[PDB]
Amino acid sequence: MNIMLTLLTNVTLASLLVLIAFWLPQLNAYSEKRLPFSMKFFLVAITFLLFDLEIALLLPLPWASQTNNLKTMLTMALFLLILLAASLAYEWTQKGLEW
Amino acid sequence: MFMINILSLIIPILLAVAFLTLVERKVLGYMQLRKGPNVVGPYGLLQPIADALKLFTKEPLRPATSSISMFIIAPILALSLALTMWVPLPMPYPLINMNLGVLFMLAMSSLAVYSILWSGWASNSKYALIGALRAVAQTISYEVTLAIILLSVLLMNGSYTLSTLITTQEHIWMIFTSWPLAMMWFISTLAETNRAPFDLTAGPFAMFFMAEYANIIMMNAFTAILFLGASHDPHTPELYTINFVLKTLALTITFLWIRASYPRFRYDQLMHLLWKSFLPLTLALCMWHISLPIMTASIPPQS
Amino acid sequence: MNPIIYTTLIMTVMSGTMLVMISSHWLLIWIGFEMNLLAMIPVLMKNFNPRATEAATKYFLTQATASMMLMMAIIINLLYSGQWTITKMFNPVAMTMMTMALAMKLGLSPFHFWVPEVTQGISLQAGLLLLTWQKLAPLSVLCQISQSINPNLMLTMAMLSILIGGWGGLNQTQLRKIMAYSSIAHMGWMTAVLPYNTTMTILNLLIYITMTLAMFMLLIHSSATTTLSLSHTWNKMPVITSLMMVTLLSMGGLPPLSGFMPKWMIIQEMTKNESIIMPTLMAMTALLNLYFYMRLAYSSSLTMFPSTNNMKMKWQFEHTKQMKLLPTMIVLSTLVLPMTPALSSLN
Amino acid sequence: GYSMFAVGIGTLLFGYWSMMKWNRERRRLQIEDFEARIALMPLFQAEKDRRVLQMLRENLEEEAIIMKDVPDWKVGESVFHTTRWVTPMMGELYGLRTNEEILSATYGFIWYT
Amino acid sequence: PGIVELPTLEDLKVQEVKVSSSVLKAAAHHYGAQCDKPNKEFMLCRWEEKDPRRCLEEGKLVNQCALDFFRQIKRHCAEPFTEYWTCIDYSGLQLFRHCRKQQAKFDECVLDKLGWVRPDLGELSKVTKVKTDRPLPENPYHSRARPEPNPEAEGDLKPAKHGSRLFFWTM
Amino acid sequence: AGRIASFLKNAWAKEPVLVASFAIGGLAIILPSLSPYTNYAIRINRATPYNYPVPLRDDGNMPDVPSHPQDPQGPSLEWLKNL
Amino acid sequence: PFFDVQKRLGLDLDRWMTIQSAEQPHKIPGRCHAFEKEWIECAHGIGGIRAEKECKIEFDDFVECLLRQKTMKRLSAIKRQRDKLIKEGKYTPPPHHLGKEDPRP
Amino acid sequence: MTMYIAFILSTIFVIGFVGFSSKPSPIYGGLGLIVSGGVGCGIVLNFGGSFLGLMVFLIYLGGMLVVFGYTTAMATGDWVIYDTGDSGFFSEEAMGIAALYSYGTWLVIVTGWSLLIGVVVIMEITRGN
Amino acid sequence: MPLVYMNIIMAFAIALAGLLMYRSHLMSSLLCLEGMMLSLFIMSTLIILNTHFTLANMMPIILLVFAACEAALGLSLLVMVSNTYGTDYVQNLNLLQC
Ligand SMILES: CCCCCCCCCCCCCCCCC[C@@H](O)O[C@H](CO[C@H](O)CCCCCCCCCCCCCCC)COP(=O)(O)OCC[N+](C)(C)C
Ligand SMILES: CCCCCCCCCCCCCCCCC[C@@H](O)O[C@H](CO[C@H](O)CCCCCCCCCCCCCCC)COP(=O)(O)OCC[N+](C)(C)C
Ligand SMILES: CCCCCCCC/C=C\CCCCCCCC(=O)O[C@H](COC(=O)CCCCCCC/C=C/CCCCCCCC)COP(=O)(O)OCCN
Ligand SMILES: CCCCCCCC/C=C\CCCCCCCC(=O)O[C@H](COC(=O)CCCCCCC/C=C/CCCCCCCC)COP(=O)(O)OCCN
């Protein structure tokens, strides 16, 4: 409830300020007188998406450290990070990071 | 007495980002062997008021041919995110105490690029669209490293709670435990907020400017809390508040100093810098920080 | 593509199918399907061209929709019974939706429209892999839950598949579309015996895989895509045309060739359950498959079509690359009727 | 060149040692707090059982009063074939209570920030 | 199917412990050390019976024992305990680390008066044994009778009679 | 031996970031299997009481199970205190 | 079809997540642990058909625990009748249900 | 009771799905998708799954729908199902999710391999030729 | 079965209908697929959290990951189509026919 009130207050204040800034100069009358589609941008977007997915996999590490299976958890975390590094390396060597 | 707290957290932030422009002009002027604004008011103190009044009384240059919907939506989202990204912060007691505060900050920072995307799309120009695309790509690329560094550092904290960061650094700053991660985090915050050397690019313009400067102050306060902890005495929080504010101001002055003291990167140069210098080191240091508590039997408590 | 990358993608496709077949969790089965779909796309796009891209995007759209439907069915089944193990579905709506998802994955009618176009756009090698290997995971999943599937839905979809394959095969001229419609009809035949005996389903799957592997390898050997390109083959390698005609006769269900073993056996099983009208209908429908196979045989081997002068130069050069297991595939798809009882091996 | 790397590594090692000691102390404090909670648990369990049973009894009394006119209603009829004790839902306890405590019970922990 | 049985409100009446959470946390260690036997009996009964309605007497016993413990504390060491729980109460997290000094004063006072030794680290979390005369419940799950298993017949394999017997195949 | 040293010297020039990253990653992979404190970390994790310890029913044949928390029987956390 | 590699090798690749009552972390119990345990023990080594026919009581209780349809129906009926009576005016709620009660710890 | 806040959020979710399901001007359908995703995250957070809701709000909105918008621009009744007891001194959702590394070794292996193969597949497809 | 689950399944059905309608703009088809995925995530999360099936909390995250990967794949294909035609209208994919 408190966070909902905070978000509503923030949005309301921002909207009110924007509209008053937009309408204060509007009271006074005045004169009132493609193809390229670069592939590199799409490639960097896709790379960001995939690395974001791997980061999502990596996120629960702070709570994963208390399991009594420290060897298995450590092996799995290092496996995930090694796969992330290997994906980056494959993208690097095959000229996937060129402008 | 909750709305009072929200207003007392919102209005001072806006005043701070109002006077940050004056402080930045003065600092750059004195670094460039001149004086900043010192005619309007005693020492330029009335300059932000004059700038705001001039901006709000100037006619807006609405394209009259674009999508007015997204054109008016984008500043709303930018300012709303900039203001709502302050509530988890403990100084020293957060306004809203959340278990997963850091993830909330990361999520809002990730959402921040929608304003850039929509402003570029609604600008109705191919050049503006290209600029927006470059800005979006840079922001997301650097936010990847932001997230990785954040989780790697929090591995020594115990959880995602922001308040616990005060307890972790009670005896020693986190700057000494991991300085390389801190330096890469500082550069990532510089590049995320579009600041030199990474700044390739009436009403809504002022809206965007306030959002950007509020993001600057937020990022610097977050870095101060995360890496430069202050002693917290429960019976007198004013000491912690003073220390935290001083560290935030020092980091902001460092931001202005860095802007004034360096040339700017190219787009491809900064993309290369990230993808080929920060990300490999970030992965290596994340592995090191995963393995370190198990090596030294110093796993943080909370779970 | 690089040979190492191609080998890795093929291993990933096989690993996804294996994960689907050897897993006892619905989530792991869905993961296996996703891995199969993810690695299968570049195999279609090995020879880059607009037709391959369009076929690949059609295949991706259909498979993604099927996977989403399958996941929704899994979610509903979990909701109405907190079980993840692949067993009795415990819900009618979940079973119906999962049946539609597996029909989309398999290609049974009326979800059959994508098969002819995807087969036509993509190459012969890609088509061969898609036609035989892809069927193994959905068929295994259907066999694992055959005790819960509604006989009405499966039987009507199988009948519609047989009818549609038989009718659509008559019109086509390109060989790849003929193979697509043949696959549709064979799967209509094969899924009709799922509620009764899954061993017959597996036996029909094995026989069909052998026959279509042999026919696709023969089509690759004599690089023919349209009917006339196949008619030109007799002037260079008559043995290939003769073997192809024998395999085509086998694929039509003519005894004593191997292709008669499944149909016959399948009919027998549906006669044990007092189902008489349907096997008769499917036999008279498979007569249409026989008809267009016979037309292809007339065009290819039993008559000598006009040749071309330049073909003389092709007389001097031999096939540099020989594909192993082609003679074995032909023999297994033509002369294994006398060993029919070996189906008791629960193959 | 060597001196800068040596200084950096020395700072890293000092920070690691200090954090090791502090984190071990935090582990000990956490164990102490958990032991205090463990010592306090049985009283809380007893009070919770008593409160749940009292709420169920009050709901049963109200059901007996209200359902008096419904013809085929059996007051306090279980919906499970087994006779084993089954933990009641939130609605089984706060079904007939006022709305504010319904909201408190269902949403207070989530909404408390 | 069936009628649930619930104890009358007179069966749930007991002298409640009317102290706040901080007061309970201040004396949690000594309460656990001294009042251990009724607490352990109640908790074992709760875990074995799997039914709140079969453990009312142990709940009343633990309430009474806690009241006796707090009455002793009030009689002997009221003021140091008051200071200690006030300090514990002030903090938001109610941390023991904040005011070890007041805790030391309270511990020494209660060791002087009642001779109580504060349990060390790793002692209140031990698993213990309880000697009780309550009979072990024979079927706490109220389960039915398990259905009879399949015959699972056995024997020596013999060759199939007349082979496969599949149509005309004689082998 | 000489070729490997020459290659490492070459990589340490004009590419120090990759060398540092690989060295740190290799150290993080290798070291935990050699450190003697990892078993201490496992024991510390095991010693944290998250759930209520349910007492066992006494039958007269449990000498290793203490009857009171103060009793000497049972696991002790003196090793943790000394750390 | 189903090549049971796990049971052949005893690997336990994916069997721990199949059911609610199988070794949860920190021994956190499922909401319907008891009912699922009862049904599983009823239907083990019996076969699909016999388990469906004979252990229907346990499965019905399990589904009732999972979805609580009958409990919702009963509570809705009670609430509707109480609303009708309070509309006619023959029923008044006690202080306990009006917030005027004496709360207990 | 808050006018069935779960029901209000579910209805707003359905309204957003209807709005973006008509597929008008794919950028506007995207905007409807962000609205629906925000409402769904609100539902999940209200239910009690804070980590999963924040997971949606971070991954889905920040990365995946952002990539969607990037590519587009480049071109032309309740409250009764709940529990009764407590979770102890931890959050059950966080423990279950963090059990991915100690229990779900198979899941981690297959997901990592799938992601690596996805990288390879994307490079192969976008290579061109 | 409460109204929340009914509304979620209704949302999934609406998204499926939108995907199958196919007016134009294959990007809209991908958006409909991802709306279906989001509905699946919400429903699975609610079901798993309601029953305290702790070990199943892994399932949504995993799901999301895989689904997002598919989305990426789909986008790639879309791009190629545009690079061959200049635009992503669905009616342009008519070279292959039954
Ligand atoms: C043309 C006809 C098809 C031919 C197919 C190719 C022939 C070559 C294949 C080489 C051997 C195949 C298998 C390799 C042996 C080891 C694998 C073995 O362990 O698998 C066993 C099983 O063995 C195979 O199933 C038998 C393979 C034999 C296939 C031939 C039967 C064809 C019948 C009609 C044609 C007669 C033969 C013609 C010449 C080959 C385990 O069975 P099980 O895990 O417990 O049950 C799983 C099935 N369920 C789930 C339905 C219950
Ligand atoms: C066995 C066959 C080997 C050859 C064939 C390989 C086929 C494909 C490769 C994938 C199969 C690998 C098998 C791994 C199965 C995981 C389960 C098993 O390993 O036990 C685990 C043991 O963990 C091991 O550390 C697994 C490490 C293996 C992962 C490292 C390398 C994996 C590479 C596999 C291919 C992936 C892509 C290629 C990478 C190079 C569980 O540990 P445990 O503590 O008892 O149980 C915890 C649960 N509790 C809490 C109930 C007790
Ligand atoms: C015994 C076990 C010990 C464990 C090992 C740990 C030790 C690790 C030792 C090495 C770690 C060092 C990592 C530091 C980060 C490296 C970044 C980097 O290398 O990038 C630079 C580039 O970095 C930059 O130039 C960025 C400049 C951006 C402007 C900022 C100027 C810096 C001045 C500001 C002060 C920084 C403040 C830091 C403290 C912040 C407080 C919170 C190199 O790029 P190039 O020159 O192009 O070379 C690559 C091609 N060969
Ligand atoms: C087994 C551990 C693995 C995990 C740890 C590392 C994780 C993350 C780090 C790796 C991320 C991806 C790396 C991708 C590698 C790509 C290599 C490459 O192609 O780069 C070459 C250049 O790189 C090389 O020279 C080859 C590799 C460099 C050295 C590799 C490691 C050397 C040995 C490491 C260990 C050192 C010895 C240990 C000493 C211990 C202390 C005494 C091309 O240069 P460009 O940048 O493209 O050109 C720009 C200028 N025109």
Any overview of this molecule?
The structure is cut from a larger assembly and holds 9 protein chains of 9 kinds. By secondary structure, chain C is mostly helical. Chain C has helices spanning 3-22, 26-44, 50-80, 92-106, 114-121, 124-133, 136-144, 151-171, 175-191, 198-221, 227-231, 238-251, 260-272, 277-302, 311-314, 326-334. Chain C is built from 16 helices and no strands. In chain C, helix 3 runs antiparallel to helix 4 (92-106) and helix 9 runs antiparallel to helix 10. Chain D has 113 residues and is mainly α. The radius of gyration of chain D is 28 Å and the shape is elongated. Chain F has 83 residues and is mostly helical. Helix content of chain F is 48%, strand content 2%. Chain F has helices spanning 2-12, 16-30, 38-46, 78-82, and one strand spanning 56-57. The longest helix of chain F is centred in the first third of the chain and has 15 residues, at 16-30. By secondary structure, chain I is mainly α. At the C-E interface, loops of C face loops of E. Strand 1 (129-130) of chain E pairs parallel with strand 1 (56-57) of chain F, so a sheet runs across the interface. The complex binds the ligand CCCCCCCCCCCCCCCCC[C@@H](O)O[C@H](CO[C@H](O)CCCCCCCCCCCCCCC)COP(=O)(O)OCC[N+](C)(C)C (2 copies) and 1,2-dioleoyl-sn-glycero-3-phosphoethanolamine (2 copies). One 1,2-dioleoyl-sn-glycero-3-phosphoethanolamine sits between chains B (180, 182-184, 186-187, 197, 223, 227, 258, 262, 273, 277, 281) and F (15, 17, 20, 24). Chain I: Keywords: Electron transport, Membrane, Mitochondrion, Mitochondrion inner membrane, NAD, Respiratory chain, Translocase, Transmembrane, Transmembrane helix, Transport, Ubiquinone. Chain I: Belongs to the complex I subunit 4L family. Chain I: GO terms for molecular function: NADH dehydrogenase (ubiquinone) activity.
Task: Chart the SSEs and their pairings.
The structure is cut from a larger assembly and holds 9 protein chains of 9 kinds.
Chain G: H1 5-9, H2 33-42, H3 48-54, H4 56-67, H5 69-88
Chain H: H1 5-21, H2 26-47, H3 50-74, H4 92-98, H5 105-127
Helix pairs in contact in H: 1-2, 2-3
Chain I: H1 3-21, H2 26-50, H3 58-85
The complex binds the ligand CCCCCCCCCCCCCCCCC[C@@H](O)O[C@H](CO[C@H](O)CCCCCCCCCCCCCCC)COP(=O)(O)OCC[N+](C)(C)C (2 copies) and 1,2-dioleoyl-sn-glycero-3-phosphoethanolamine (PEE) (2 copies).
One 1,2-dioleoyl-sn-glycero-3-phosphoethanolamine sits between chains F (8, 11, 15, 18-19, 21-23, 25-26) and A (82, 85, 88-89, 92-93).
List descriptors.
part of a larger assembly, 9 chains, B: 303 residues, mainly alpha, 12 helices, I: 98 residues, Helix Hairpins, 3 helices, binds ligand PLX, binds 1,2-dioleoyl-sn-glycero-3-phosphoethanolamine, ComplexI_Subunit6 (chain H), transmembrane helix (chain H)
